Scaffold this active site. Structure first.
Site, PDB file in Angstrom:
ATOM      1  N   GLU A  91       5.117   0.068   3.603  1.00  0.00           N
ATOM      2  CA  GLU A  91       3.750  -0.256   3.994  1.00  0.00           C
ATOM      3  C   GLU A  91       3.386   0.523   5.254  1.00  0.00           C
ATOM      4  O   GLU A  91       4.261   0.981   5.984  1.00  0.00           O
ATOM      5  CB  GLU A  91       3.601  -1.761   4.251  1.00  0.00           C
ATOM      6  CG  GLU A  91       3.622  -2.599   2.991  1.00  0.00           C
ATOM      7  CD  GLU A  91       2.644  -3.752   3.026  1.00  0.00           C
ATOM      8  OE1 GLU A  91       1.594  -3.676   2.343  1.00  0.00           O
ATOM      9  OE2 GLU A  91       2.915  -4.756   3.730  1.00  0.00           O
ATOM     10  N   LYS A 133       0.476  -0.123   8.285  1.00  0.00           N
ATOM     11  CA  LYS A 133      -0.652  -0.908   8.783  1.00  0.00           C
ATOM     12  C   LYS A 133      -1.199  -0.377  10.099  1.00  0.00           C
ATOM     13  O   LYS A 133      -0.561   0.432  10.771  1.00  0.00           O
ATOM     14  CB  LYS A 133      -0.250  -2.374   8.942  1.00  0.00           C
ATOM     15  CG  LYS A 133       0.221  -3.041   7.657  1.00  0.00           C
ATOM     16  CD  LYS A 133      -0.845  -2.991   6.575  1.00  0.00           C
ATOM     17  CE  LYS A 133      -0.369  -3.664   5.297  1.00  0.00           C
ATOM     18  NZ  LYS A 133      -0.611  -5.136   5.281  1.00  0.00           N
ATOM     19  N   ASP A 167       0.793  -1.234   0.000  1.00  0.00           N
ATOM     20  CA  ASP A 167       0.000   0.000   0.000  1.00  0.00           C
ATOM     21  C   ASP A 167       0.826   1.285   0.000  1.00  0.00           C
ATOM     22  O   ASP A 167       0.273   2.387  -0.021  1.00  0.00           O
ATOM     23  CB  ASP A 167      -0.988   0.013   1.178  1.00  0.00           C
ATOM     24  CG  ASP A 167      -0.306  -0.133   2.530  1.00  0.00           C
ATOM     25  OD1 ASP A 167       0.261   0.863   3.028  1.00  0.00           O
ATOM     26  OD2 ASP A 167      -0.392  -1.230   3.124  1.00  0.00           O
TER      27      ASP A 167
END
Lengths: 261, 261
Positions: A95, A97, A75
DNA sequence: TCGCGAATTCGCG
DNA sequence: TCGCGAATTCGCG
């Protein structure tokens, strides 16, 4: 760093750029720093690429693919630099999260749990999925000497200091950072071999045991230890740091370009 | 194999022994095969063990632990053998995971999805968690030359052949094995470097690239490719196979025991 | 007690 | 279209 990136960082902060967006800003800061090198941003890598990379190392590897169009989509995205032989060398994967709604639950009023009675929600294990993309890109980079994987953590499940959150009705609910009903940080530390959280572990380490000498690829796991949201400027400077390190490791394959164009 | 384990396998089948239970049966079959060696079954390993193993290799490793009592609990358990120096060498770790309710949904009548209209549920990503325990035990075994990790798959999300399931009202719903709305097998193949699914990848492989020569630790990913439940006998024979291979790799550190007691 | 594990539905582009 | 990603609640011992 240098001065120019202080400008870029404030721009990130001014707009609250998400991790993928900051990743693009990093590609832009680098091509602004190394005008003779070609950089590229990518938002996915499909499993065929990974397999082809695997076979280049040992012909028994990369041999399976059940869904043809299967891909990896970090992402934050991938940034790459073109080396002296036309090859694209990855310099950054990122990333970001999230886990643990606790702080927002007890900032305003909401008791959770099976019968609406608990102050804390007992943390789940979803964050363990991050080990897949790490082993995907590590295999992709199985022939490199660096590993620029940056994973950013946010939420009540990744605390490194004790924080106390006051309820609407004054009641001060208290989060203890080493509570194994909240803290899920230990679910990530296999990804960098228990080396320092919140540091730049980009350059690959070579250990041994017998007739060995073997390479370790360690993820850079950064946590916002106090529960707050990440500051987009810091996110930038870290990703820029990991990047530049990747470039130092790639130097030998970047000389002729930088020295001529 | 030999004859004696044909008896043990039928016992597993006769009782539908779960993966942890079959793991115990394997420890029993081995101590029945090697009466001079000491075997042990364990149902968890706590992170301190892993870290201490890590530090024995390189003193920068294994350095973090946020929750003290943090542990790893593979639902199949760990089996170990005691070597010639009093050390416990792991010979088997096993897991058995599940994903995809599709076949049971369309065996009887149930349309799923956002508005009760879809024949298939689009598969989720939960099975990616399995990469954590793999990197935990791989780090634990970072100084070994074998890696006896067996992961068993079951459900509509891990098919390797086209199957057709007839609805109650005769309507034959059809599952295509390479459909990337169901098949999540590709989410696992980073764990064994794209080497063969459904095979014994226990003995570690050493590849290279530059001044390298490096070790790969590959998970043994077995799938029940047709959607059915695993047969407890097969589960046994596979785990016994992986075990014995682990013993062949450990031979040098097992000689004095087997040759004297 | 404290902590690990289950996998799920579905939005998105 | 087909496929990847989100993380969640809570049982268990």
């Amino acid at each position: 760093s240098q001065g120019v990136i202080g400008i870029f960082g404030d721009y990130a902060k001014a707009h609250d750029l998400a991790v993928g967006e900051v990743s693009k800003l990093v590609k832009k800061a680098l091509s602004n720093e190394y005008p003779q090198l070609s950089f590229r941003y990518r938002d996915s890598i499909k499993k065929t690429e990974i397999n082809e990379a695997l076979k280049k190392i040992d012909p028994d590897l990369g041999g399976t693919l059940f869904v043809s169009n299967s891909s990896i989509k970090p992402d934050g995205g991938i940034v790459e630099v073109k080396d002296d032989y036309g090859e694209w060398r990855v310099v950054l994967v990122a990333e970001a999260k999230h886990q643990g709604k606790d702080i927002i639950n007890i900032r305003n009023g909401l008791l959770v749990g099976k019968r609406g009675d608990q102050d804390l929600m007992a943390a789940g294990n979803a964050i363990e999925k991050s080990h897949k993309n790490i082993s995907e890109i590590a295999n992709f980079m199985l022939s490199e000497s660096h590993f620029p994987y940056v994973l950013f953590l946010e939420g009540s499940n990744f605390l490194t200091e004790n924080i106390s959150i006051t309820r609407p009705d004054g009641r001060v609910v208290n989060l203890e950072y080493n509570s194994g009903i909240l803290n899920r940080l230990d679910r990530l530390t296999a990804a960098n071999y228990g080396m320092p959280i919140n540091s730049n572990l980009c350059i690959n380490k070579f250990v041994n045991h017998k007739d060995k000498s073997i390479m370790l690829q360690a993820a850079s796991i950064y946590t916002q230890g106090d529960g707050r949201e990440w500051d987009s400027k810091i996110m930038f400077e870290i990703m820029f740091d990991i990047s530049t390190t990747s470039l130092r490791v790639l130097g030998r394959d970047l000389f002729e370009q930088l020295t001529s164009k």
